[PDB]
Amino acid sequence: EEKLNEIGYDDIGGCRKQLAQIKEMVELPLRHPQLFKAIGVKPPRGILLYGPPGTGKTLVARAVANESGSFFFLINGPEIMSKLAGESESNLRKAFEEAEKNAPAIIFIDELDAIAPKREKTHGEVERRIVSQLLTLMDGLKQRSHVIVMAATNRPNSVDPALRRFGRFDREIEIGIPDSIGRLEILRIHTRNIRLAEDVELEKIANEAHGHVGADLASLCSEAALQQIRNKMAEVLNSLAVTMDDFRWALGKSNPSALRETTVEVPNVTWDDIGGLENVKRELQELVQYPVEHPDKFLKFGMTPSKGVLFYGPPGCGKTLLAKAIANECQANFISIKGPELLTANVRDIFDKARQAAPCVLFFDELDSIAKADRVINQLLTEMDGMSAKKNVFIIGATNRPDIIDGAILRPGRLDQLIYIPLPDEASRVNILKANLRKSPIARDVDINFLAKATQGFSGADLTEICQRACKQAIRESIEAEIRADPVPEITRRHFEEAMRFARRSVTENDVRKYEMFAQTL
Amino acid sequence: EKLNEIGYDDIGGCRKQLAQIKEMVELPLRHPQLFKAIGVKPPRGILLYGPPGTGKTLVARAVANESGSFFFLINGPEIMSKLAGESESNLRKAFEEAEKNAPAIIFIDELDAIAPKREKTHGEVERRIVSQLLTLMDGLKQRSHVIVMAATNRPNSVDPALRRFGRFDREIEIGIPDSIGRLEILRIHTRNIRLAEDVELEKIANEAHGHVGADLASLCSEAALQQIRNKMAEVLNSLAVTMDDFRWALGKSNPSALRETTVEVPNVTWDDIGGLENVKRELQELVQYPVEHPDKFLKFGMTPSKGVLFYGPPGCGKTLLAKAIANECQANFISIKGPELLTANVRDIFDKARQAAPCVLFFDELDSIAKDRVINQLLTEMDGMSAKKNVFIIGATNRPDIIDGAILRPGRLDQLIYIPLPDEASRVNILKANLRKSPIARDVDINFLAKATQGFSGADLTEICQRACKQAIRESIEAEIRADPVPEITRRHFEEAMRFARRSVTENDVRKYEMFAQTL
Numbered sequence A: 001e002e003k004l005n006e007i008g009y010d011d012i013g014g015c016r017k018q019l020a021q022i023k024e025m026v027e028l029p030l031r032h033p034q035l036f037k038a039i040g041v042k043p044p045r046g047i048l049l050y051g052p053p054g055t056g057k058t059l060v061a062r063a064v065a066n067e068s069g070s071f072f073f074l075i076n077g078p079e080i081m082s083k084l085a086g087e088s089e090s091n092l093r094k095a096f097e098e099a100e101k102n103a104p105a106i107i108f109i110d111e112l113d114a115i116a117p118k119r120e121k122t123h124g125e126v127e128r129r130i131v132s133q134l135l136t137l138m139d140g141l142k143q144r145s146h147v148i149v150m151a152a153t154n155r156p157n158s159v160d161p162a163l164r165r166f167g168r169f170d171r172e173i174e175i176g177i178p179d180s181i182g183r184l185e186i187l188r189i190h191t192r193n194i195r196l197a198e199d200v201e202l203e204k205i206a207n208e209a210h211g212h213v214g215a216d217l218a219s220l221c222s223e224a225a226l227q228q229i230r231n232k233m234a235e236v237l238n239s240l241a242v243t244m245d246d247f248r249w250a251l252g253k254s255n256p257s258a259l260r261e262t263t264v265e266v267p268n269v270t271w272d273d274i275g276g277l278e279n280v281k282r283e284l285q286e287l288v289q290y291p292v293e294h295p296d297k298f299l300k301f302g303m304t305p306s307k308g309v310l311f312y313g314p315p316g317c318g319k320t321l322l323a324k325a326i327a328n329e330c331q332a333n334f335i336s337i338k339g340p341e342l343l344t345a346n347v348r349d350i351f352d353k354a355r356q357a358a359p360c361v362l363f364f365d366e367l368d369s370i371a372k373a374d375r376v377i378n379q380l381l382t383e384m385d386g387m388s389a390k391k392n393v394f395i396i397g398a399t400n401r402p403d404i405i406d407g408a409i410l411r412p413g414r415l416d417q418l419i420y421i422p423l424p425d426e427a428s429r430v431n432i433l434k435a436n437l438r439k440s441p442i443a444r445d446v447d448i449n450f451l452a453k454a455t456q457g458f459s460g461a462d463l464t465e466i467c468q469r470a471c472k473q474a475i476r477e478s479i480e481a482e483i484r485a486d487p488v489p490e491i492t493r494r495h496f497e498e499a500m501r502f503a504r505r506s507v508t509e510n511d512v513r514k515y516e517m518f519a520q521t522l
Numbered sequence B: 001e002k003l004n005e006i007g008y009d010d011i012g013g014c015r016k017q018l019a020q021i022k023e024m025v026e027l028p029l030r031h032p033q034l035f036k037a038i039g040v041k042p043p044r045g046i047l048l049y050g051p052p053g054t055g056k057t058l059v060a061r062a063v064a065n066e067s068g069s070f071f072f073l074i075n076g077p078e079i080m081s082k083l084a085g086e087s088e089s090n091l092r093k094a095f096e097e098a099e100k101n102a103p104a105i106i107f108i109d110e111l112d113a114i115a116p117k118r119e120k121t122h123g124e125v126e127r128r129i130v131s132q133l134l135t136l137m138d139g140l141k142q143r144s145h146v147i148v149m150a151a152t153n154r155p156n157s158v159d160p161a162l163r164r165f166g167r168f169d170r171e172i173e174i175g176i177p178d179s180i181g182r183l184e185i186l187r188i189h190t191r192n193i194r195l196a197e198d199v200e201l202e203k204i205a206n207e208a209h210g211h212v213g214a215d216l217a218s219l220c221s222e223a224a225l226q227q228i229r230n231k232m233a234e235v236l237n238s239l240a241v242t243m244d245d246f247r248w249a250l251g252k253s254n255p256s257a258l259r260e261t262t263v264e265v266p267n268v269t270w271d272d273i274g275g276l277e278n279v280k281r282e283l284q285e286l287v288q289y290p291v292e293h294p295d296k297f298l299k300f301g302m303t304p305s306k307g308v309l310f311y312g313p314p315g316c317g318k319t320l321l322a323k324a325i326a327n328e329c330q331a332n333f334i335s336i337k338g339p340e341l342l343t344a345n346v347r348d349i350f351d352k353a354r355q356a357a358p359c360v361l362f363f364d365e366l367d368s369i370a371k372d373r374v375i376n377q378l379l380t381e382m383d384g385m386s387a388k389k390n391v392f393i394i395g396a397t398n399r400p401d402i403i404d405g406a407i408l409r410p411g412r413l414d415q416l417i418y419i420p421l422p423d424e425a426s427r428v429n430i431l432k433a434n435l436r437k438s439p440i441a442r443d444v445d446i447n448f449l450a451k452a453t454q455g456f457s458g459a460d461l462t463e464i465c466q467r468a469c470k471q472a473i474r475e476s477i478e479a480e481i482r483a484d485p486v487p488e489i490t491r492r493h494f495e496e497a498m499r500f501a502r503r504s505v506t507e508n509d510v511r512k513y514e515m516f517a518q519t520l
């Protein structure tokens, strides 16, 4: 009782932008109705929160209610649907009547898809009755009454379309997987009572906890604390403090439930990691950054920003790292979609998730798998064709066979600019080598400049693999020396020499000429 | 009190339809004697359909309040949320009270809930309520003055028995508003909001594409909220929404009617594209004369040919020409594309055209459909198209060879028009129209560019012009970061743009089209 009435914004983690949105949408209207009524802002009536399970979207409504001083009423879908025919209707009606009786109030309908699934899923007559009663109650909320209905679901498609119309649920907020900062916030919240040793660095755990949601991180802390019992099992109880090794063990064996869900975050890849050419850097900056950062010039000179690119070139890491870097430059969200993912209605969903994030780079890797000289490609054409050119969403394609791409996806207004990504030059190769080996020690004798001079035409994967091989050899001698017995603390020159013998190339001039002729034809 | 005060002025975006409903539902219910004497039978069922968010839910109440009739409201969800017998009791009571208080209007909001397609309604009570509605509808005597109005998203969702003669014969589509309708909606929604002196709602109306009235209300709310943001008793009094707030709201609005087809008179004129005088005269003959001079057509007893297949090099002039000819005649323009059809929608499109007596139905990328289900479905619908109705079909294909010889028969599209590369005058017009919105330097001579640019397609010219502005923006930022050093697009920008300009149609393609023309 007391605990639930004392959770606020600090006790919810992983959603800080959405939390600010909801604060502005709800708390301010319910604290100063006079101002909004005077200026003429209509407070929202229905807010549908959706996202993967375990994201903490079940606490947002209660946090807002507690921090705004508004009466909070909770409706559980399973609880309503577990009652008899008339009792469920009575409970819904009583919920809304009580909310109106004491206002301002917030009504939270957990698992809305249980009460109001798609009409096809519903088979009986009582279920349609409860859906219709919910619609009637929603439409019965006067603009004066200060009742805001908040609903939680996994996918809004699972809810009956009649509920998502205007006046019932017109605002939808997605509370998705948290980023590194969100994961760190969640870990701090969950470790508020667990005693931790002096060697815990929650930042590393947050950075390495990919595909984790709030619920998963709670399990990770529980598992890490459990092992501290195993190793150590009054004085024993007092000497218990979770250690970094326990956290690493827990993270290694944890199966996150959100590995397959697309991520939307600003990538941590900069220009220096990849290097790149000045021409391509300037071109990408012109195409993307200026519309986002300098719209005044654009409107002044009255041009519509062209918002489509088709990266084409050799097949390595070149095109995707460039897209992530340009996204990082503008602090814009990055959405990466591969051909296999699309091949396996989802096109509209991905475009909607792009439109939700205003500055966004939508990457379509392996575009050839879809656009080739049938249902999916038409969907991509129509969805992108009906994309307003005044919205800061940039669609960046990528294909290693630019001659198999149909002309429909290159028709101006869809993707009107083609950029070539050549084999990295000497400076680019130096940058790639340094970036790959940053997280490993290198003997002072090893000179990356000479290696870059020797490596001509090696693709990005090659340099990564050359580094992996030279390292893989280092582990072998480390074990071999250990078995014989830090005899080998650094990756000396000999390791790179013997790792630079059976590495020849991955794409020779034989296929470079293909792209270099395609360039001349364009 | 507030509901009873709603009138015609309080609904926006449906001026034509509201005039139609006026002539259908007010003049009769106000002067029954005249209509009875002449022999006009007032309608008994009117089904208003369209996208959500429109004022189609308020048309019935406006008509009731302005005609003095008694208004009764039936909600689909409310009726269907009751028990087995209470739903029928409510419907019967509604109709009985309407008959008692005649003249009256019965509005059934969300008819699809009460009477969805019979494939649905797996239960037995739902069929009972649908049959009760049908029985009540058939029970309205012609002498009684009860008019039943209904609202739905798509009439296909309603039971086909409800849409017969005598139940719901008339069907009015209240759809996405045009620029004037959007301006009316904005004026209605901003009657209480305080507006600054620097706000001109015409621009907002023009730029708010795919916006229904609800979206415009949301836009106004967001603009006011951003004013509150930027500014947070004197503070209360010093709040006035500003043009910047409206532009922000437009920028970050997500309208719900982007994917819905538009039916409006395009704002494209001949001067924006030029075109050959031959093509202009031919299009005039085919389209304008039947619409503007039908007496002569009847006099000479010649049935006008309805159909053209524009063929030529890819670009924009096959679509802009259709828009221009539609604009000349103030006729509606419907633009369909191959991607849309590939994904019976054809009958729906043809009905949305037949609804508008004068129209120009444009089928772009026709090669995709023609050379199996769709093409035959497209052929049959046109073959069943009366030649005396002012619906013109204007196809457009960039590869006139792959098109089957079936679409090109003399009841179907029976005329071929060639749209060549724009001549010098056409290029001058295209260049001038493209940069009408961009401040140009007085030194630039578009005539010289037109002389130099030979064979460049419409897209090419637009791209050449876009590059010239891209150079201008870069120089503006470069000067700004170094520091209006670059107020206008100078000649040098155009020179740089031309330096790497490339023709988009090879002379081989021009020769191929010339050979095809010689074939005809």
Ligand SMILES: */C(=C/C(=O)Nc1ccc2oc(-c3ncccc3C)nc2c1)c1ccncc1
Binding pocket: A315, A316, A317, A318, A320, A321, A460, A461, A462, A505, A506
């Ligand atoms: C780097 C590469 C990537 O994501 N994909 C990729 C695609 C194709 C490919 O072929 C090779 C190859 N290299 C050498 C010899 C033979 C072959 C087939 N490597 C690749 C790699 C990357 C991008 C983003 N993040 C991490 C890595």
Ligand SMILES: */C(=C/C(=O)Nc1ccc2oc(-c3ncccc3C)nc2c1)c1ccncc1
Binding pocket: A407, A410, A411, A412, B314, B315, B316, B317, B319, B320, B458, B459, B460, B504
């Ligand atoms: C103009 C054109 C349009 O709507 N579509 C279109 C079709 C084909 C096409 O090819 C190019 C092109 N141009 C230069 C080089 C390469 C290519 C493939 N551009 C287009 C454009 C238009 C009509 C109506 N409203 C606005 C624009």
